[PDB]
Design a protein around this ligand. Sequence first.
Ligand SMILES: *[C@@H]1O[C@H](CO)[C@@H](O[C@@H]2O[C@H](CO)[C@@H](O)[C@H](O)[C@H]2NC(C)=O)[C@H](O)[C@H]1NC(C)=O
Ligand SMILES: *[C@@H]1O[C@H](CO)[C@@H](O[C@@H]2O[C@H](CO)[C@@H](O)[C@H](O)[C@H]2NC(C)=O)[C@H](O)[C@H]1NC(C)=O
Ligand SMILES: *[C@@H]1O[C@H](CO)[C@@H](O[C@@H]2O[C@H](CO)[C@@H](O)[C@H](O)[C@H]2NC(C)=O)[C@H](O)[C@H]1NC(C)=O
Ligand code: PLM
Ligand code: MYR
Ligand code: MYR
Ligand code: DAO
Ligand code: CA
Ligand code: CA
Lengths: 118, 406
Amino acid sequence: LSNGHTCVGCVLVVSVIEQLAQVHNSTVQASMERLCSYLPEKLFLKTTCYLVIDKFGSDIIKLLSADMNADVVCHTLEFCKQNTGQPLCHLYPLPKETWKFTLQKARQIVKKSPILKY
Amino acid sequence: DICSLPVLAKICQKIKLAMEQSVFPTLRGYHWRGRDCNDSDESVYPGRRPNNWDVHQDSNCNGIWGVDPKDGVPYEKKFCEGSQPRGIILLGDSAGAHFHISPEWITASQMSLNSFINLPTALTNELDWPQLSGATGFLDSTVGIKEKSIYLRLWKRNHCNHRDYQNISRNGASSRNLKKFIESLSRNKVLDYPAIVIYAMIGNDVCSGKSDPVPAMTTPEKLYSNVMQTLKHLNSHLPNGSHVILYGLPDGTFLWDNLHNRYHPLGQLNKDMTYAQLYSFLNCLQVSPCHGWMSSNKTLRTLTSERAEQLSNTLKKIAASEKFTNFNLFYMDFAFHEIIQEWQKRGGQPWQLIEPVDGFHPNEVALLLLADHFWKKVQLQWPQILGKENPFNPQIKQVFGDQGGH
Ligand SMILES: *[C@@H]1O[C@H](CO)[C@@H](O[C@@H]2O[C@H](CO)[C@@H](O)[C@H](O)[C@H]2NC(C)=O)[C@H](O)[C@H]1NC(C)=O
Ligand SMILES: *[C@@H]1O[C@H](CO)[C@@H](O[C@@H]2O[C@H](CO)[C@@H](O)[C@H](O)[C@H]2NC(C)=O)[C@H](O)[C@H]1NC(C)=O
Ligand SMILES: *[C@@H]1O[C@H](CO)[C@@H](O[C@@H]2O[C@H](CO)[C@@H](O)[C@H](O)[C@H]2NC(C)=O)[C@H](O)[C@H]1NC(C)=O
Ligand SMILES: CCCCCCCCCCCCCCCC(=O)O
Ligand SMILES: CCCCCCCCCCCCCC(=O)O
Ligand SMILES: CCCCCCCCCCCCCC(=O)O
Ligand SMILES: CCCCCCCCCCCC(=O)O
Ligand SMILES: [Ca+2]
Ligand SMILES: [Ca+2]
């Protein structure tokens, strides 16, 4: 289930992935793999890092590669859920394009599934 | 709760296990309290009066034991009897436990394999670093200030106090919930030395995450009730001759004033996120550690500082009037303004006293400056609290060296 804490955590991890790619001028995929290689094997940290790439990696790549920010990503993946009526929670400034249209784009980018995993 | 995510199931389960295998189980590891020198014998632990002067076994784990072959006198009797040993005990919150998220874990520009080596231990200790705290820290400060913790200054004044520290602190502790873990305090009226007890609930009574945090803040009436229960409890467990010090609450407006325009570690790369944006983000989610003070709503910040002043005055009033048989009571202003002044005399900026990642807690420098202010103020106004310097300190070091370490 998604709550305020899962939202903070998704925004944190995605931000770090984004900035690690920027610092090393690399793909998002290579950024996630580099981050997981930095983590100790203790307490299943490195293992968990690789479970997250497996479950969420392809969509983080698709969205960041479209120049969506960490707020967009975490709303698209439902770690952050805006109840109808309630205000919008965002850590980074709202993008140039309007949020409602930016989020529709994001949902359509991950609805495409040209690759199946067995 | 974060552990609702299926992908985190294995690491959440393994964190829970490691905590259980420490011997609130973490509160017994040596980061939180003096290492037990013999965990197969429950009459051996730090803080107790020596059993038969420790002629065979070091029963209080202070590294002083045995007999001098010159005169057949027990070293513990020659070196520590009369010196009036005493322990240090902190009843605290996330600041007393030194909650700390390392910027190295989240700032990509300097991140490497070296950065996360300390992460597993921090996770099994709830991200608290009591071994570096201002009250009970014993490791070499990772920063560049000579000041030491209250515990180490106590050891320096009297080497017989080695290992007699207890940090009974929890993230989210307040006057309301302290009774849920105060039982982890270990002290026996008859068998143990007296203790200095610091009561430092410095935030969570006015700090909340709810959108309307004013109704959640403790009232002076409820605080008085909670603290009297705690003091009645301590009076039944502390040896006669103990001292209890109540800390007031901070004027938490220094956070917003000094940080709202500064970049967070996640915003330093592209200069696109300030502490103001973080505070707004956390309040919109209702997960801020302190909505009242971490907010752009200057009215709300004032109502929080106003209640903190009322609660502080309650503690001051309890200390002047209420009496107890086994300890005397003292009140101490948090006095962060004076901490800032001392830092500025060392060339420092106020924003450098806050934990960079959360923008809320005092960092290691601040905790050590609070300990230095505590020491100088107590030594000046209430010297009895700290006792006398032990003339045999040099002879203790010559016979016992580092006294076993920590
Ligand atoms: C940093 O990586 C970027 C990748 O975006 C590189 O920039 C692109 O390089 C190729 C050259 O073959 C071009 O097709 C693109 O037009 C470039 N720009 C963009 C926006 O993609 C760049 O080469 C790398 N920088 C360094 C110093 O190696
Ligand atoms: C730790 O405590 C145990 C006591 O539980 C000590 O074991 C005793 O040691 C003495 C030797 O002086 C023997 O007479 C007893 O028979 C031992 N008791 C048991 C149950 O074996 C042990 O020596 C202590 N060790 C240290 C380093 O303090
Ligand atoms: C700024 O903070 C104050 C204090 O919380 C808010 O005022 C209170 O708002 C609650 C609504 O949740 C009411 O119950 C009180 O009657 C209000 N008191 C006062 C003095 O206004 C105020 O609404 C906040 N301002 C903004 C813009 O959020
Ligand atoms: C993605 C945004 C960046 C994340 C920055 C971290 C947010 C702060 C997390 C630590 C705050 C919690 C401290 C607990 C305090 C208490 O319980 O007393
Ligand atoms: C994109 C999937 C990643 C989600 C799991 C990563 C969670 C990392 C730490 C979470 C931070 C907790 C925030 C908080 O304490 O309030
Ligand atoms: C590229 C994927 C990076 C994801 C890193 C997040 C997983 C490791 C850190 C999670 C720590 C969670 C500990 C906890 O739940 O208390
Ligand atoms: C970016 C991956 C490393 C970040 C680890 C920072 C600490 C994780 C968040 C702490 C909260 C928790 O563990 O419940
Ligand atoms: Ca023992
Ligand atoms: Ca001893």
